[PDB]
Design a protein around this ligand. Structure first.
Ligand SMILES: *[C@@H]1O[C@H](CO)[C@@H](O[C@@H]2O[C@H](CO)[C@@H](O[C@@H]3O[C@H](CO)[C@@H](O)[C@H](O)[C@@H]3O)[C@H](O)[C@H]2NC(C)=O)[C@H](O)[C@H]1NC(C)=O
Ligand SMILES: *[C@@H]1O[C@H](CO)[C@@H](O[C@@H]2O[C@H](CO)[C@@H](O[C@@H]3O[C@H](CO)[C@@H](O)[C@H](O)[C@@H]3O)[C@H](O)[C@H]2NC(C)=O)[C@H](O)[C@H]1NC(C)=O
Ligand SMILES: Clc1ccc(OC[C@@H]2CCN2)cn1
Ligand SMILES: Clc1ccc(OC[C@@H]2CCN2)cn1
Lengths: 383, 381, 382, 383, 384
């Protein structure tokens, strides 16, 4: 009636078009499938499982000599819309998949022109497999790729061609989590392998460091600066170990948070995942030295005696380097003499006790410089 | 008794893949409308909205007509969907799943070929979000419906009414629908050389903040209140460090949770995250001052010497400003008693310095109570 | 089986019986569809996603006038077991599904009697969408519905109807969480829009509360009863702040657990979920009062001065309202006089110090009753 | 080939809807047997059993028979399953979907008509967990098979053997199978009119108590041991509240974890839950007592007064029961004051030391009570 | 269109019903050469003892019904055809845990002039394994893959091996597990011959770089903090904090380790026993710390000192622990004498207190020696 059904009735049947035979006119002639990817939206990039999901369109073109009709025999109708399948199709699918089913995309329509040309453009959602590298988190830049190979044919039968080196980015709504740098496309062939041909599109994506530079990096710095503070305490308050244990617990919490956003591989560890371990080691050593200082501070002459070397070293030498500077009448006389002599011995005990407290202050100040010197020099090796 | 005959005669000379236009080179008209039954959920971490819809297509047909006579009665009919030709109105901004529509509900075919097709569908679209007012926020989602393969010259997509019909909606508990309108746009795409038509339905939802206030906001302000109390504790109690540590850990936990339950977009920062970081940095700054105050409380003249300016300052000037007022055998007996008395005199002289260091720690604690209580109150406002 | 083969072949081939036409030989001929739901086991009710899962055997019976043999010419078969996908069906499906699909479960055979009856009975496992009310959470009674509607036809084509005004238990395995109260059934028709009909079954259930009474409720009361002991610890003990802070975090952790067995809504909050907030407020005020008492206890005449008005009210009037109450020889003379005089000044200051340690004791007893009257008033008001 | 003629003459008139019986009144005797392959899991919180098993059906068709002398390719004909008659054997007590795992597989076919269909199937059955001696429980999960359509007058579900064959079993690591059996019933359902038959296979499994002994018994026993110590600490150190609070928090966390592990059935209460609740109550009682000995240890004669009854009763009974066992006159006037000051101070001190002894007796009283009470209730609760 | 000619004739002229094995007689077992090609290792998840792999099962056999020559139809020698048209032997994995048995998707085969058939279908697999975890930081396992045919047996097919090793030509190396060897072998039963199959082993190593420098050092730091617990002074008043924190950290680490890997099916790993031993030691340390704290706070007004205590401690035990322990004129006399006598009594009540303080020092030091020795002589058994 409208000649659009008559075109089909004269082109597909009667002449018996076949959808199982390649349109190769003869032998030793390859098909010329073209390709042009077009991005539409980057859904998300996953790091725990190393999976990248996208929403792309895959335009394809080739030529079939069987689909040719006279444009004057049928009034008008230069273009006809053959529906899903019903013609030959080079089965080109994404190779590296997540589930591994190598599943084809749904078929919509093939706009077939008069001169044998066939255009296709199916929409698809792909979940490829990436190789997420976490060493500058959260300032890293990644590179995940897609590979397209024919599911049935091979080389010496088809010739995959890239229509444009770059991938089209039209109708692309952007992402507030990842950036886009470049979308190059390559065609890999092996001179020795006679059946290898594919096209690879590389995705170079830069991360935006604002949801982590305000959520994870700042509190770690604050907690480290807290970790420094232990040695500036009077040691009489009775709350020295509480600060150390609290700092250790906070650092453990922050370390356990990070290990949920990082792949459990064994190749490299983030530059922020080693600073925490360094700080843990330093805090444990601070705990040990705080226990030693607390033990030293509580000594009295009735339990321990001070060796001459301890006095000579820690009361004269070290503080200079650390810049620290400090018958009835006879019976009455007999009774009174004991009271004054009792006080004389008491004042000597207090002098010795107050010397054990200054030793515990020189020891404490010595480790404030040692730990701080290590905490900076040892960190500059991590940047 | 003749419905089978009508089916056989109608479905004999019919081609499914051809457009139903008798006079070719004439676009066909398709009327579109959508109906919402339930807004399943609005996922904020992954930015996905899930709804249930009843798409409605009403298009005239140049064929599939008959005469109500001969076959007495049978004014309308029901035919399987696959037999007839349908337009492929697909959802553009998909998120996960399949582009096509679900269901196989048959189409009611009228006397003049008008076809009413109403298939059910459950969609998972993509919706950008703004979290700058996270407890009390508004969102602007959108659904984009348009034909995939056909163009403007072959399809004339119109609309029925500029509103989604809320004739059957199981109300969502946490989100409130405030507006829903549709519009038609004429757009031309890349890699194609023809005009295409489009229809966009954009929802407008509002949140009910009851669950996210009595669970997130009130404990945050409770913990923020407990910070200032550090500077009212005495230095001899021995519990000065516990309060600061507990406050810091509670703030850590709250920030961790709120970070967990929000989208990871870095376009902007929520107004609550700024306050949480602000309170966190002041809380960290208060542990430092406590350590530098407990060290002044335990100073003695046998180890530290008071300078010449910490006497005029911190004892006369600042206390006035902060309203802190400052409140023979006789010879042998003679020297024995004299030594006892002189020992007592030098003990009270030393104790005088031991309480000046205690008063300086009280002034420093007070001068920071007012600084904190100002910025803490002023910071919120 | 020589009779069955000829019966089936003749009946389903010679007439060319098409399973796409509703049986009707009149103007309207509303073919009625009897329904009788039969429960088998209540699987689970999920109060977080408000989804309930069951195991039912829906039963449908109509009368097809195109399947009526003679039953004496065919050697007397009197019954048949035609498979499902050969007979016209009315397509009755659940109309409030959770996931979204409407289709019925496995298709089995349907018995066709000799007078035209049909007795389809397909097993199914549904997942409806309930509205869970949470206000007495350990002791609550719910109301979940199952609405069945025709997926293809409506009035002027069919007319649904019930055969029993209740659901049948039959093969039922009792659950340990919920117990069945009643299962009513009702047909909904709107007498102004003809193209509407459905059948709704109400699932009324009640929880068994021993689990959440053994857990949750008892520990909450145990940790709430510990909130008043902060007012009895001595101020020189040194663990006042340790006790009254660890309690607050324990209450906070218990609240977050409760909000995990409760759907995220904005309409109802459990009565247990409101007591915890009241206790939280009380504990925070207790922390503030404890800090104030600690500051009052550690005072000395060398740093603070006791105002004359403080000496009266406390230590005179408030304590009784609380039922509580408490040459040569000259040098020896001069030196000894100084030692005695020094002891006199020390004793006078120790009395002033002991006044501050009793003022802080009276204050802590005053707040013990105040933080007790408002606890009873709040508990009664729920 | 002769196999083609055999297939053609077999499926030239066969109909797959009629019971293969010589008349219209004879049951189709079918034999049944279940072989278990792998017990997947026995999930308890959401009570469900999952298994992999093979179902063995044997019956006797009568129209599928040929001469084993006229033809060759005899005694075997692997016919696809969905082409011949098949009894509909389904699992009644199913949890979610999977009412009948049909598949495709193949069906054997001898020359006397017999068929030996054997399809694999995975079943998510539902069995109610019964916990009272967790983690030493003893489960009895069961499976029920039956023909959904035909009644006892048309299908006779016989059984072969008396137990599930186990010569395929990949032994599980947590559950040990004790005795799996099978038995047959005859039922008349309410929503029916004729007799129906079913075959029930009931598994009898026993848990292996080592995973939960290490992680749920040893730490809880340690925590229960540690709470007694708080009555031995002196009041002068200031660490009773820390100990009791830590014990209470640990007990609460362990009880909540145990709640997360076991189901929500409200029929019977596990013994371990009873013990946890009992220990929690006891720990909560200790915090109340600890406050009342700290309040007594810090009493002075200036504030409090001894009421003359606690003195006598405590200090005269409790330790026995508890087995605790000019110018010269001016100098005299000023000297007299100093001696009198010391006399008043000593009298005050001896009263204060009496309040410290009362708190020691009270603390030891509850140490004996707690040890005695905590063991004669545990000996009754725990078997 | 020679492919059209050959495809039409072969499947119809020869009456290929795809349901009959290509046998010239009854006992003509069709040899089926097999080969497996590994592609990925995915995961060796130990919580459920289930792996995941991607493989290419290469099969080969001979068909006598697919032959054409002596006519040379446009010179065609390969007749690539979809799978569901010709006879297949149905070789499936016989130790699957998911219940899936067949290949993922049916691809196309190849057909040559002499009748040979070559097939390479892809398939994902989740087998079952017995996990030995007695050396969890660095463990060696042995995981097998079993292939068998569920329709035929040794009287119909003759499964054979091409090479006694799988192929890793297309294997992408994994950053979690290290491959050692993949030996393949056949199996047959002399008694009642009906069983035939092939098996592939997947001997792997864990290449410890994540569970050896992390979570092994934090398990020894908390282990060695106990001597610090024992070195604190009693007057500091912080022993309970340190000991309780150490115990809680150890319990948390043990629970996390148990969560990561199911500890015991029949045998416990070599780190859980160490953690249990350390927890027992820490509990004993807590008990002894409470006893020492009680001993420290004593005075000659609440407790007495038996002579045997002074005989044992302060005399003998400290030496073996290497400790040192270094008118009115008559009335005024009465008041002065009272003051002096009171001071003498006070000095004697303080020396007894200092005897109690030193006894708690000996007991605390003695248990440090026992703890430092048992923790070393008890770690040889469970770590060597
Ligand atoms: C965000 O909310 C706005 C508010 O509705 C919506 O986007 C814009 O909405 C206005 C009116 O609501 C649209 O303007 C309308 O367009 C018609 C075209 O015929 C014109 O005649 C009028 O000017 C009329 O007001 C506007 O087109 C629309 N913008 C876009 C880009 O569609 C929508 O709900 C949400 N927008 C997005 C992008 O999500
Ligand atoms: C697991 O539960 C089942 C059912 O609750 C029980 O074992 C089985 O119980 C049935 C009876 O309900 C036994 O079937 C028949 O019992 C009758 C007596 O009532 C008698 O005629 C026969 O002994 C017949 O078998 C069935 O044998 C029995 N299964 C066994 C023993 O393996 C029982 O509560 C639990 N099973 C076990 C083994 O404890
Ligand atoms: Cl066969 C075919 C031809 C053109 C085509 O354009 C799709 C455009 C993108 C918006 N609709 C799709 N398919
Ligand atoms: Cl058509 C039909 C007839 C009978 C029937 O009984 C079901 C009962 C449940 C145990 N068998 C089901 N369906």
């Amino acid at each position: 009636a409208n000649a659009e059904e008559k075109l089909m009735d004269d082109l597909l049947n009667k002449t018996r078009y076949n959808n199982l035979i390649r349109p190769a006119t003869s032998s030793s002639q390859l098909i010329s499938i073209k390709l042009q990817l077009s991005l539409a939206q980057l859904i998300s990039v996953n790091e725990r499982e190393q999976i990248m999901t996208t929403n792309v369109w895959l335009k394809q073109e080739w030529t079939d000599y069987r689909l040719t009709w006279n444009s004057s025999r049928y009034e008008g109708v230069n273009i006809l819309r053959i529906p899903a399948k019903r013609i030959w199709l080079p089965d080109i699918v994404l190779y590296n998949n997540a589930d591994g089913t190598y599943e084809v995309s749904v078929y919509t329509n093939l706009i077939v022109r008069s001169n044998g040309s066939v255009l296709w453009l199916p929409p698809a959602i792909y979940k490829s497999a990436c190789k997420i590298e976490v060493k500058y988190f959260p300032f890293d830049q990644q590179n995940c790729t897609l590979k397209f190979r024919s599911w049935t044919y091979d080389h010496t039968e088809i010739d995959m061609v890239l229509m444009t080196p770059t991938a089209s980015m039209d109708d692309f709504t952007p992402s507030g989590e990842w950036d886009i740098v470049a979308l190059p496309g390559r065609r890999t062939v092996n001179p020795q392998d006679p059946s290898y041909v594919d096209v690879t599109y590389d995705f170079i994506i830069k991360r935006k460091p604002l949801f982590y530079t305000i959520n994870l990096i700042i509190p770690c710095v604050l907690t480290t600066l807290l970790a420094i503070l232990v040695f500036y305490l009077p040691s009489d308050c009775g709350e020295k170990m509480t600060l150390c244990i609290s700092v250790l617990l906070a650092l453990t919490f922050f370390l356990l948070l990070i290990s949920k956003i990082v792949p459990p591989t064994s190749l490299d560890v983030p530059l922020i995942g080693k600073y925490l371990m360094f700080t843990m080691v330093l805090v444990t050593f601070s705990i040990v030295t705080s226990v030693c200082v607390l033990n030293v501070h509580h000594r009295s002459p009735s339990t321990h005696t001070m060796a001459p070397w301890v006095k000579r070293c820690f009361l004269h030498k070290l503080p200079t380097f650390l810049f620290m500077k400090r018958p009835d009448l006879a019976e009455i006389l007999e009774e009174v003499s004991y009271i004054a002599n009792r006080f004389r011995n008491q004042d000597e005990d207090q002098s010795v006790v107050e010397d054990w407290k200054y030793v515990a202050m020189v020891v404490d100040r010595l480790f404030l410089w040692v730990f701080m010197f290590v905490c900076v020099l040892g960190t500059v090796g991590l940047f | 008794a003749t419905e089978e005959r009508l089916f056989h005669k109608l479905f004999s000379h019919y081609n499914q893949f051809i457009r139903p236009v008798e006079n070719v080179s004439d676009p066909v008209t398709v009327h579109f409308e959508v109906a919402i039954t339930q807004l399943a959920n609005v996922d904020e971490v992954n930015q996905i909205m899930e709804t249930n819809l009843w798409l409605r297509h009403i298009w005239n047909d140049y064929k599939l007509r008959w005469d109500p006579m001969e076959y007495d009665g049978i004014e309308t009919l029901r035919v399987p969907a696959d037999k007839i030709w349908k337009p492929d109105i697909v959802l553009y901004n998909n998120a996960v799943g399949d582009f096509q529509v679900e269901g196989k509900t048959k189409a009611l075919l009228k006397y003049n070929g008008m076809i009413t097709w109403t298939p059910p569908a459950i969609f998972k679209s993509s919706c950008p979000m703004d979290i700058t007012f996270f407890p009390f926020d508004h969102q602007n989602c959108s659904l984009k419906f348009g034909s995939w393969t056909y163009d403007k010259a072959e399809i004339d997509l119109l609309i029925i009414g500029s509103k989604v019909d809320m004739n059957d909606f199981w109300e969502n508990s946490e989100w409130e629908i405030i507006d829903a309108s549709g519009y038609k746009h004429d757009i031309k795409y890349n890699c194609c050389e023809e005009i295409y038509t489009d229809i966009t339905y954009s929802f407008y939802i509002r949140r009910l903040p009851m669950f996210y206030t009595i669970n997130l906001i009130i404990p945050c302000l409770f913990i923020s209140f407990l910070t200032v109390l550090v500077f009212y504790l005495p230095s001899d109690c021995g519990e000065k460090v516990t309060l600061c540590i507990s406050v810091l850990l509670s703030l850590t936990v709250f920030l961790l949770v709120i970070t967990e339950t929000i989208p990871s977009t870095s376009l902007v920062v929520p107004l609550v995250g700024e306050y949480l970081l602000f309170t966190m940095i002041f809380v960290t700054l208060s542990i430092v001052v406590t350590v530098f105050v407990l060290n002044i409380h335990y100073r003695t003249p046998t180890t530290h010497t008071m300078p010449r300016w910490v006497k005029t300052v911190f004892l006369k000037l600042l206390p006035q400003v902060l309203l802190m007022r400052w409140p023979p055998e006789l010879a042998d007996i003679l020297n024995e008693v004299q030594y006892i008395a002189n020992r007592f005199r030098s003990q009270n002289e030393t104790k005088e310095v031991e309480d000046d260091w205690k008063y300086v720690a009280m002034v420093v604690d007070r001068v920071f109570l007012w600084v904190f209580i100002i910025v803490c109150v002023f910071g919120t406002a």
